[PDB]
């Protein structure tokens, strides 16, 4: 029902070809086991031939007769085999792909045209509800899924089952025993894969839990970067960040350890079962003689038949996820629930006029529970007149204008256009008789001529001319270049808003409506253009019956009748003078109103260079990958020898050889493969593991040892920094992971395959590699064209989608309604191009897959053809033919693994490129010397002379210009300024966060410019507005080690004693040992600040700095901190920039700073004697 038929709906001839393609899909899937049925038949005769060939040791020429005859007979069969299947698989392939396009093409185009139509046909509803953009976003993403759902995936789906159901048919008929054995190994292989999901999901969350700590430390620190710098607590965060990484790495290796155990064991159970299938498969031959090895190989193919089921599930998942998502929204997608608007029939008034009538209308907006904005209404406006409505709290008048256009059916009552109800008449016609001017105009992106043409489809520029000329819009447009053909670029913001609205009036003027609706058209506009547009409105009035709502009473003066609402409740009606006479609601208002990243530059091999530099030793891991590499072909070699000697060899000795090779297939793989895979995994695993440490180490420290506009004023963000730490280290981990993987398969194929390739007849080698690279490139060139079409497809619908998205985001198109079909008209022409392109890719995708399978039969052809014929012609052998199959599985593991790790090499390379350029850094200030920290430098007399400053934004109009100050030791230097900066900046420059553009600053008289960065920050009293508390023990919070300073219990006691935070310290559990409770969630600012104060006097700075410390606070908290602050200072130099001028009254030197320029400076009463900026500051303080 709703699930399937509509998903597939219509398509009369489409449905017919849909089955033809389906039909063609079956015989395609059927062909593959039939192709493998052939493999047994050729095996059978060749085996019978081999049995007599080893059986000779007497006659020779006899072996030259019959054995070659059968082979020649087989050569006769060979030709009809690849061809019979090849011509078959070629044709039906091109057919099954036409399903992917031709069926999908007409369906989607049918879906698109109705969907795009039904949306505009829902009318009011989208404004009533949902997302109106996020909605039309996902929905168009959903229709994209349909192409994946109704495409050849289904054709592929039937193909798989044909190999599945059709595959097992042949198996069971030719025996029921091997099936069961194969049926027995299915859950076991599913069991091992079950270990995987448990391991992956569990180990991911652990690592996530581990790096979360590393992430959390990086989280607050990078936010607290300004805090840590001043106090120089970097090296502690340094050590911790290494500690969390140490744990995150150990969970990493165990994941790798266990993973390799699973992946290793997973393949064991495959090869063991694979061996077990043969051992019981062989036993039915030697002592039994039922199978000649036909089905034995064929039952293996049933596993290949079983893998198609594994290939089937995604296609089902592709269909189902397409089905479910589409049909549920399909109910919304299609039809026209409508039934308040529609498009059609109804009554056409020819009366060419109508007195507007509103009668007892009770209405509510579709917000449901929201109260009725309008409860009852009575308004009747005579023809030719102009009625004015007004209000206060908002809307309720706007409702009356909205209902008149029948945009909302009233709950009770009726609105009568002319004498008749509005609900009888055709809506399309109604909209045309109603012009509407909204307060905020909108212009579609087109010429001004076209935006008017959107008002009425059939029109000529003469009417366009007369329209604007009467609307006085004909001035700015002429001066404007391109004239009427002038486009409106980048949506609607180009020109003056007043001109925009004026055009909208001209648009409504072409409409020549018999009703005119003005909603606050004059509102939200400059005073000058208002009078201009008003005149246009005035010239748009007097000729047409109208109703106007705005908040400008100047325009209401000339109205014939005014009606009060104030919330939508009707009260007064009549002429202006009559209203003012009442001195009512009207009169009352009148007098009252009188995050992305990744710059382009790449690595270019510097990766492995820096990697090996950071990778101290690992030659055992890769060498282990090599011995495992050459291990793979041995399997392909052993099995080749098994059936090889089984095919060519006599009845004697058959048991031992098969027995000997069977065990060999086990121990060479099962014993060794598990070892080497786990052996390498422990190596390259820990390799990537420790790389994750050193990198993130050498990054975060390279990040912390540099600030300088990467931190102070970056265009970046906290998330952007953390993101860098995550992806980069994770990617390069895969980069190295891709290295060993390739080298592993490299020797596995190139190295060993060649050795095997070398023992061929040298033509067989060439002929084989005349296939594999060609089919590889053929598979590659397909991938390019595939994405090439996919991208080109996305671009075409993009332009169509944008102009589509343009329409739905603009809901005002429905008030004119002229463009309803007109918009869908352009979309049709817009959608017409991908349609032909869909037809175009039908042929393109059709030929690609066809050619892909065309190389398949050609491969098996040349394999057995040349394996027969000339080789059959002279010295036909059991070898070199199965070695071809060996070279194939090497060609299969090459493309599969290499192309898989190809994009892994990509994102890593890019991510590595970022992390490399970042780690180069620009260390700037770390240690050096620059000064000797003289014993006479304690003092604290701070000099400022001719200091100018700007934070690193060049044309930012620097806040400091021509600034000079001075402060004596042991006294408070007060500071006060307007807002923002120059307050804060002064304190910042003393931290030497940024060296000023010009001038100099001195502390003992020594040059800060030439002073050591560290020691300058060794004595500082910095206290911010809202102090950031690191999550840790408050005791460890109270004491932040400046350099060597150990946590001192007796000291932090004095800290608490002075900071008056000892109150909380006295009581409460754990006392000093109390954690902040998840980012200090249990404490308020006053408490936090006391601790910050305690942090300051621990260091015992000779210089204290208070940046708006008491700015956020209240009541006793303000006084108790001030008590601490006052007691914190007066022993040493301090600078307070605080905005509290009531508590500044005790200060030694108060300084008035005007935007970089100190205006007045001196003691309070002295400045108080003066007048200027400062006295005003106190005057405004009240």
XYZ file of C-alpha atoms in Angstrom, residues 757-988:
232
model
C 54.232 -14.797 -13.120
C 57.836 -15.596 -14.063
C 57.196 -19.351 -14.278
C 54.494 -18.879 -16.936
C 55.045 -19.347 -20.671
C 55.829 -15.610 -20.814
C 52.865 -15.001 -23.117
C 50.455 -16.097 -20.395
C 52.087 -13.521 -18.131
C 51.722 -10.762 -20.723
C 48.182 -11.827 -21.626
C 47.234 -11.831 -17.941
C 48.684 -8.355 -17.401
C 47.041 -7.411 -20.672
C 43.884 -7.898 -18.610
C 44.320 -6.813 -14.975
C 45.744 -3.312 -15.504
C 43.307 -2.692 -18.368
C 40.271 -3.765 -16.311
C 41.710 -1.723 -13.434
C 41.966 1.462 -15.508
C 38.561 0.605 -16.993
C 37.305 0.441 -13.413
C 39.152 3.670 -12.628
C 37.947 5.679 -15.642
C 34.429 4.582 -14.668
C 34.877 6.017 -11.176
C 35.956 9.356 -12.660
C 33.026 9.555 -15.075
C 30.658 8.445 -12.300
C 31.634 11.283 -9.968
C 32.021 13.513 -13.016
C 28.342 12.999 -13.762
C 27.353 13.210 -10.090
C 29.000 16.611 -9.683
C 27.642 18.011 -12.959
C 24.223 16.748 -11.873
C 24.442 18.607 -8.549
C 25.298 21.904 -10.263
C 22.270 21.943 -12.581
C 19.669 21.217 -9.904
C 21.521 23.719 -7.706
C 20.501 26.739 -9.757
C 17.019 25.255 -9.989
C 17.040 24.459 -6.274
C 18.159 27.969 -5.343
C 15.432 29.716 -7.345
C 13.170 27.070 -5.827
C 14.501 27.797 -2.341
C 14.108 31.449 -3.312
C 10.373 30.973 -3.792
C 9.508 28.949 -0.678
C 11.444 31.283 1.628
C 9.356 34.112 0.191
C 5.778 33.448 1.258
C 4.589 36.759 -0.149
C 4.292 35.164 -3.590
C 0.889 33.769 -2.624
C -0.679 37.223 -2.127
C -0.307 37.962 -5.849
C -0.792 34.307 -6.863
C 0.105 35.337 -10.428
C 3.414 33.518 -10.053
C 2.115 30.238 -8.594
C 2.189 28.310 -11.862
C 4.626 30.832 -13.349
C 7.277 29.874 -10.785
C 6.606 26.200 -11.394
C 6.786 27.036 -15.109
C 10.407 28.182 -14.914
C 11.178 25.199 -12.677
C 9.820 22.868 -15.353
C 12.190 24.406 -17.903
C 14.822 24.286 -15.159
C 14.011 20.654 -14.332
C 13.894 19.862 -18.052
C 17.684 19.976 -18.389
C 18.523 17.284 -15.795
C 15.761 15.184 -17.374
C 17.636 15.041 -20.681
C 20.809 14.676 -18.611
C 19.157 11.775 -16.793
C 18.455 10.291 -20.215
C 22.073 11.113 -21.038
C 23.488 9.233 -18.041
C 21.171 6.328 -18.843
C 23.399 5.659 -21.842
C 26.535 6.612 -19.883
C 25.949 4.481 -16.777
C 24.580 1.823 -19.107
C 27.762 1.537 -21.164
C 30.081 1.668 -18.125
C 28.754 -1.300 -16.159
C 28.308 -3.196 -19.430
C 31.976 -2.669 -20.308
C 32.920 -3.558 -16.723
C 31.289 -6.972 -17.119
C 32.496 -7.140 -20.726
C 36.024 -7.315 -19.339
C 34.859 -10.068 -16.977
C 34.109 -12.698 -19.626
C 37.066 -11.491 -21.690
C 39.216 -12.216 -18.644
C 37.937 -15.776 -18.186
C 38.106 -16.181 -21.964
C 41.776 -15.331 -22.475
C 42.566 -17.146 -19.226
C 41.231 -20.536 -20.333
C 41.539 -19.920 -24.089
C 45.305 -19.434 -23.961
C 45.383 -21.878 -21.053
C 43.941 -24.232 -23.636
C 44.774 -23.992 -27.351
C 48.527 -23.346 -27.749
C 49.254 -24.626 -24.227
C 46.819 -27.476 -24.902
C 48.410 -27.747 -28.357
C 51.756 -28.677 -26.822
C 52.575 -29.755 -23.257
C 49.192 -29.058 -21.641
C 49.811 -28.739 -17.901
C 47.825 -28.485 -14.661
C 49.850 -25.469 -13.564
C 49.909 -21.873 -14.859
C 46.125 -21.975 -15.266
C 45.346 -21.931 -11.538
C 48.244 -19.516 -11.141
C 46.226 -17.126 -13.301
C 43.438 -17.296 -10.718
C 46.134 -16.581 -8.135
C 47.261 -13.441 -9.980
C 43.593 -12.383 -10.113
C 43.028 -12.540 -6.343
C 46.199 -10.436 -6.098
C 44.632 -7.959 -8.509
C 41.542 -8.076 -6.314
C 43.433 -7.345 -3.084
C 45.462 -4.593 -4.762
C 42.629 -2.377 -6.028
C 40.439 -3.105 -3.003
C 42.977 -2.208 -0.313
C 44.925 0.527 -2.151
C 41.868 2.502 -3.280
C 40.452 2.093 0.234
C 43.508 3.650 1.888
C 43.819 6.200 -0.924
C 41.454 8.753 0.651
C 42.948 7.807 4.027
C 46.225 9.073 2.582
C 44.385 12.209 1.440
C 42.687 13.623 4.560
C 45.798 12.709 6.535
C 48.050 14.619 4.123
C 45.821 17.694 4.438
C 45.491 17.347 8.223
C 49.243 16.802 8.475
C 49.751 19.929 6.382
C 47.923 22.029 8.988
C 49.626 20.512 12.021
C 53.077 21.011 10.453
C 52.665 24.701 9.632
C 51.194 25.258 13.106
C 54.014 23.520 14.995
C 56.626 25.691 13.212
C 55.097 28.378 15.413
C 56.767 31.713 16.107
C 57.917 31.022 19.705
C 58.718 34.685 20.427
C 58.842 35.089 24.203
C 59.808 32.071 26.261
C 62.972 32.619 28.307
C 66.035 34.463 26.951
C 67.573 36.823 29.507
C 67.323 40.533 28.633
C 67.790 41.526 32.316
C 69.454 40.428 35.542
C 66.610 41.075 37.999
C 68.500 43.594 40.144
C 67.829 43.733 43.927
C 67.038 47.457 43.556
C 64.204 46.662 41.151
C 61.576 46.009 43.816
C 60.334 49.582 44.200
C 57.285 49.810 41.956
C 57.307 53.254 40.384
C 55.690 52.612 36.993
C 56.389 54.948 34.069
C 54.312 55.577 30.934
C 55.488 58.000 28.276
C 54.058 58.752 24.836
C 52.448 55.323 24.700
C 50.173 54.463 21.793
C 48.533 51.075 21.293
C 46.226 49.104 19.058
C 45.122 45.496 19.340
C 45.999 43.524 16.190
C 43.359 44.920 13.888
C 45.022 47.431 11.576
C 42.331 49.991 10.754
C 40.689 49.745 14.180
C 41.327 53.364 15.236
C 43.780 52.648 18.116
C 42.396 53.338 21.591
C 45.698 54.595 23.035
C 47.184 57.769 21.533
C 49.706 59.998 23.304
C 49.417 58.418 26.732
C 51.727 59.064 29.677
C 51.342 58.213 33.388
C 53.332 57.746 36.602
C 52.736 56.054 39.969
C 54.840 56.072 43.150
C 55.466 52.880 45.125
C 53.267 51.791 48.018
C 50.296 53.801 46.789
C 47.160 53.329 44.695
C 46.979 54.713 41.172
C 43.321 55.194 40.340
C 42.049 55.131 36.770
C 38.726 56.098 35.144
C 37.549 56.333 31.521
C 34.423 56.167 29.365
C 33.893 52.424 28.646
C 35.485 49.435 26.983
C 39.147 49.788 26.411
C 41.978 52.008 27.500
C 40.726 51.025 30.939
C 41.603 47.417 30.461
C 44.376 47.887 27.914
C 46.706 49.715 30.312
C 46.658 46.699 32.627
C 47.173 44.440 29.596
